[PDB]
Design a protein around this nucleic acid. Structure first.
Lengths: 93, 239, 159, 74, 94, 258
RNA sequence: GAGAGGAGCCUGAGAAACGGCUACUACAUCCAAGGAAGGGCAGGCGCCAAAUUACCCAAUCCCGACACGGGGAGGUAGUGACAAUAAAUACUGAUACAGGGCUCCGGGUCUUGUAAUUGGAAUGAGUACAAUUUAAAUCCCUUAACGAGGAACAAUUGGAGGGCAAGUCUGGUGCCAGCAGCCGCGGUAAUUCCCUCCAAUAGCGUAUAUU
């Protein structure tokens, strides 16, 4: 499956999002489907499906490792007033 | 032949996509003034101060393709994307290299929508451009149209609007020809009605292209049907 | 001439190469290295750029394993030849380390992705393998020779 | 129902000189060239090719010639 | 003919098409009207098959040599833009 | 040239900001305000580069416009207007602040600092002269005008205001034999201790300085900045601002490394 | 630094603002012939054809009642054998048959071949689900699946040399010799017949100037 080790988290009290590094892996699988990863960052740091923003997400060489730079909010209106537009329409919003 | 020129003739050649031929035909129609649907055979189009043009739909009969291959002033070579070439494009291309080489032949390429990947479209574009380069001229101008754009047909107009010289081919310097624009059938009603098939007088009307005609009693060949004699010449005046 | 034709034919036959371009490439790099050793020999010993610069050059060629680690002198680094570089190249280390049956089989087993070098897998058979990295030349993991799936012919054979 | 173009049409080979499958790959061609010029040096000079093999000296195979002096005067 | 490397020309008369020997120099040489110089020089068409491609009045590019008539000096390289060896092989039409 | 532009060039971008050489042509030019070009430090450069508390200007304006950040108690919703000198910057939730100081190398650094030590300010006198009403008032070096001070408090004193009305609660006296920051010359941005003052009729009378380890340099009164008598008001910068050699301070860093 | 053109004028914090007014000077467009509006660089051809009429303000940055509205800075991509770089077009067995192969007038050497019959593995170009990267796409990084037996997934550019007819042409004291030969009695769904060597080799030839 997917393995999940988060690096360099920041609580980010300035915007009430969280400046997170989330380093994942898929060894042996095809690629990881970041919307399903928006169904993966729901219980690990207590976020709903709206307030899981993910970007960066460059897969490391040879399969396996995949770096992801994510940002979970605390409210969907903070998502909308603190989130960029292409990230919204790509995020189904 | 340094004439104050007639409409320069442009050919639209290609495989049996008739919708491709009338596609580009009505497309450059909407580039110029009109917006009409049904194409007459030869249709002149006014462009700027040097020389207006005229456009034709080559049918899928390659006897007509060798007729208009004898005619053609400049060439538009309309070709598929996902299919490579078909045979009729090559037959016209070296049939024109054999008959007489015009000053400008251009490739133009359709069906770019029917693909899956831009890597496949780009690879087939570079390959197909190379085969036009080895069949036609080293570094010729090919073009692309994905189904009714306007910018691609605008720079296309910026290439067929800067007519250089209709380079002095010998047969088209010393032989008189005229593509019939308006078909006109003059017959007495008891000749056409009383006799089902006797003969009929035909006023074909068109633009004098070749060398100067005979002032009286000219023999004249008509493609497919054969050589006939001119019973009468009239001339519509011009501004 | 003919001395170059039999010389470079002996190099392209001893070591499995494709053209004479790689021979000329190796003789070019040896011309640069041997040139640098010459113009370091122009100065006396205790010229500190001959000491430190020539010392650095012989340490680098000991490290990539061309010059043998016993001899430690710049005349002995002037005395080199292209069979040292071709003897240090990856393809000939596949054959001389016995993963392959012949040298052309080794170049096939390198463009074919079957071998790895450490963590990388290496497609280029002209890879100048370092002397320290010589030992870890082995078959790649997804190859049929390093475990993995048994490849196309045995797949169509099982089916 | 479109007219397919054939292979010489796509690649105008035309009239090229007929060449060899060994000439198709240059690495195979220098492999088959070194094997032959390794073979011809066996005919001219004397190669070591191992000492006594398994059986242990069945005599001087391929004859002995007594008049012949194959040596460099020095 | 030392200022430029290739000179264009008009094929003026195919000199000696009535010869008997198929690849003799009499049949190979062709009279050429040089364009910029105005002179008439003959040049070697390298085959009788290529002589079947060299036609009258055509624009023909020529070059030199380097080494039955030793003294005819030029060489036909193209006929009407297409190279004459690519016409000799079945590469291109004209 | 010939009137103001707002475009900053990137090869000529100066030392205090740490701007990238990449990302197109233009750099974040600061516009008008209290200070000059040199000691300026915008919130653009501050919260995005010095703190890494930003991603782009949707986020930075989305911080600045919602009235959470204060500069001297003012809202300051502007990107191009500067932040000052020896600065007091607010993160009022959890009770922390940011003093901008020099390092031991001479460029600005952030500091999380308390509400009291932040709530007073060290601001230099630029001028004490006569205005309307017949009173000599005090033009500060940084922002404000301290009207009706003590009448003998003159120029080059560096004043503990309480930042709240701009009123002198203390001053540091311009003196020979006192400890001063230097901001200019060949040795700019250094904590030192002045040994002498010279008069120099003809422009910019100077001070001779001799530090803790007997290094002498004589710099002018326009760049000297008397930062403390002893009385540790402000936070201490790293290494006491002595600016020793790179090799010996490097060996001290390897000695104090954990 | 100087800007359809002299001559004057107005705004503003900043302009003798001109891609803003007023005459005069040189042209030129709509007209119902009285009147009116008018004063750029880029593109193609040129002094037989070869570098897109690309997508974006997402970044970095700039301006305005100002979180929105605007950006010909900048970024992303496309062509490109002028170079420069890596290197595909195969690897490995088994048997059978043949007795010569090669090298310098006579010498010298001992295993060599086969348009011989069979058996193995290896797949990467490519085809391509997906997901991801991104303003959006693409390249990349992953990637399931298909993907090799020559008549193919179809390596070239130069040179040297041999052989050949109920063919042709030329010379000459028969039967010889020359140059040469896609061309021969029939036959075109007619025929299944002849090559070797050298060089560079995804590159190579040619011409002149030449060093």
């Amino acid at each position: 499956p997917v393995t999940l080790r988060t690096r360099k988290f920041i609580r980010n009290p300035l915007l009430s999002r969280k400046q997170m590094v989330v380093d994942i892996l898929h060894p042996g699988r095809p690629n990881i489907s970041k919307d399903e990863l928006r169904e993966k960052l729901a219980t690990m740091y207590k976020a709903q499906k709206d307030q899981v923003s993910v970007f960066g997400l460059r897969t490391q060489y040879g399969g396996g490792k995949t770096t992801g730079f994510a940002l979970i909010y605390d409210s969907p209106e903070a998502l909308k007033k603190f989130e960029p537009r292409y990230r919204l329409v790509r995020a189904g919003l | 032949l340094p004439d104050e020129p007639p409409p320069r003739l442009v050919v639209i050649v290609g495989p049996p996509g008739v919708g491709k031929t009338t596609l580009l035909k009505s497309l450059v129609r909407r580039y110029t003034k009109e917006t009409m649907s049904d194409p007459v055979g030869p249709i002149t189009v006014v462009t700027s101060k040097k020389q207006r043009l005229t456009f034709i739909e080559c049918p899928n009969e390659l006897e007509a393709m060798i007729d208009m291959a004898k005619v053609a002033d400049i060439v538009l070579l309309m070709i598929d994307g996902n299919y490579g070439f078909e045979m009729e494009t090559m037959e016209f291309l070296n049939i024109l290299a054999n008959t007489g080489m015009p000053g400008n032949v251009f490739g133009i390429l359709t069906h770019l929508d029917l693909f899956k990947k831009p890597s496949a479209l780009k690879d087939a574009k570079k390959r197909l451009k190379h085969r036009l380069w080895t069949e036609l001229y080293q570094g010729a101008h090919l073009f692309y149209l994905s189904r009714y754009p306007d910018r691609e047909i605008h720079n296309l107009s910026r290439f067929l609007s800067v007519m250089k010289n209709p380079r002095p081919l010998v047969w088209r310097n010393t032989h008189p020809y005229t593509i019939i624009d308006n078909y006109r059938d003059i017959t007495h009603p008891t000749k056409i009605e009383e006799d089902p098939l006797c003969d009929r007088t035909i006023e074909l009307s068109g633009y004098l292209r070749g060398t100067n005609f005979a002032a009286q009693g000219q023999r004249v060949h008509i493609a497919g049907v054969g050589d006939f004699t001119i019973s009468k010449i009239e001339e519509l005046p011009d501004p | 001439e003919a001395a170059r034709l039999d010389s470079e034919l002996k190099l392209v036959g001893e070591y499995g190469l494709r053209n004479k371009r790689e021979v000329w490439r190796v003789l070019l790099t040896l011309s640069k290295i041997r040139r640098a050793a010459r113009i370091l020999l122009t100065l006396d010993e205790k010229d500190p750029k001959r000491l430190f610069e020539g010392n650095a050059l012989i340490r680098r060629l000991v490290r990539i394993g061309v010059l043998d680690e016993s001899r430690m002198k710049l005349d002995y680094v002037l005395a080199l030849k292209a069979e040292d570089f071709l003897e240090r190249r990856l393809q000939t280390l596949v054959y001389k380390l016995g993963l392959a049956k012949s040298i052309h089989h080794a170049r096939v087993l390198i463009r074919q992705r079957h071998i790895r070098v450490g963590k990388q897998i290496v497609n280029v058979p002209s890879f100048m393998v370092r002397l320290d990295s010589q030992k870890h030349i082995d078959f790649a993991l997804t190859s049929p020779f390093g475990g993995g799936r048994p490849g196309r012919v045995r797949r169509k054979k099982a089916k | 129902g479109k007219r397919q173009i054939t292979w010489q049409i796509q690649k105008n080979k035309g009239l090229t000189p007929n060449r060899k499958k060994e000439q198709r790959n240059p690495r195979v061609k220098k492999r088959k060239k070194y094997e032959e010029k390794q073979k011809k040096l066996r005919s001219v000079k004397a190669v070591y090719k191992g000492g006594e093999g398994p059986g242990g000296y069945q005599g001087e195979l391929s004859g002995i010639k007594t008049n012949l002096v194959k040596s460099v005067k020095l | 003919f030392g200022g430029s490397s290739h000179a264009k020309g008009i094929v003026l008369e195919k000199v000696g098409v009535e010869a008997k020997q198929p690849n003799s120099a009499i049949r190979k040489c062709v009279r050429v009207q040089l364009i910029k110089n105005g002179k008439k020089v003959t040049a070697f068409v390298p085959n009788d098959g290529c002589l079947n491609f060299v036609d009258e009045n055509d624009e023909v590019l020529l070059a030199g040599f380097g080494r039955d008539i030793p003294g005819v000096r030029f060489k036909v390289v193209k006929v009407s833009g297409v190279g004459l060896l690519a016409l000799w092989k079945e590469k291109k039409e004209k | 040239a010939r009137g103001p532009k707002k475009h900053q060039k990137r090869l000529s971008a100066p030392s205090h900001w740490l701007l990238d050489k990449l990302s197109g042509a233009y750099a974040p030019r600061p516009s008008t305000g209290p200070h000059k070009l040199r000691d300026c430090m915008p919130l653009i450069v501050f919260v995005r580069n010095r703190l890494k508390y930003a991603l782009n200007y949707r986020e930075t304006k989305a911080i600045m416009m919602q009235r959470l950040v204060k500069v001297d108690g003012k809202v300051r919703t502007d990107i191009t207007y500067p932040a000052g000198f020896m600065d007091v910057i607010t993160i009022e939730k959890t009770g922390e602040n940011f003093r901008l100081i020099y390092d031991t190398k001479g460029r600005f650094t952030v500091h999380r600092i308390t509400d009291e030590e932040a709530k007073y300010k060290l601001g230099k006198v630029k001028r004490v002269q006569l205005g309307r009403g017949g009173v000599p008032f005090l033009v500060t070096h940084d922002a404000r005008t301290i009207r009706y001070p003590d009448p003998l408090i003159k120029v080059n004193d560096t004043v503990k205001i309480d930042l709240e009305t701009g009123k002198i609660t203390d001053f540091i006296k311009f003196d020979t034999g006192a400890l001063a920051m230097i901001t200019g010359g060949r040795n700019m941005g250094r904590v030192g201790v002045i040994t002498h003052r010279e008069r120099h009729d003809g422009g910019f009378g100077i001070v001779h300085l001799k530090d803790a380890l007997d290094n002498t340099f004589a710099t002018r009164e326009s760049n000297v900045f008397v930062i403390g008598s002893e009385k540790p008001w402000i936070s201490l910068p790293k290494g006491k601002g002595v600016k020793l050699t790179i090799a010996e301070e490097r060996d001290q860093r390897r000695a104090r490394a954990l």
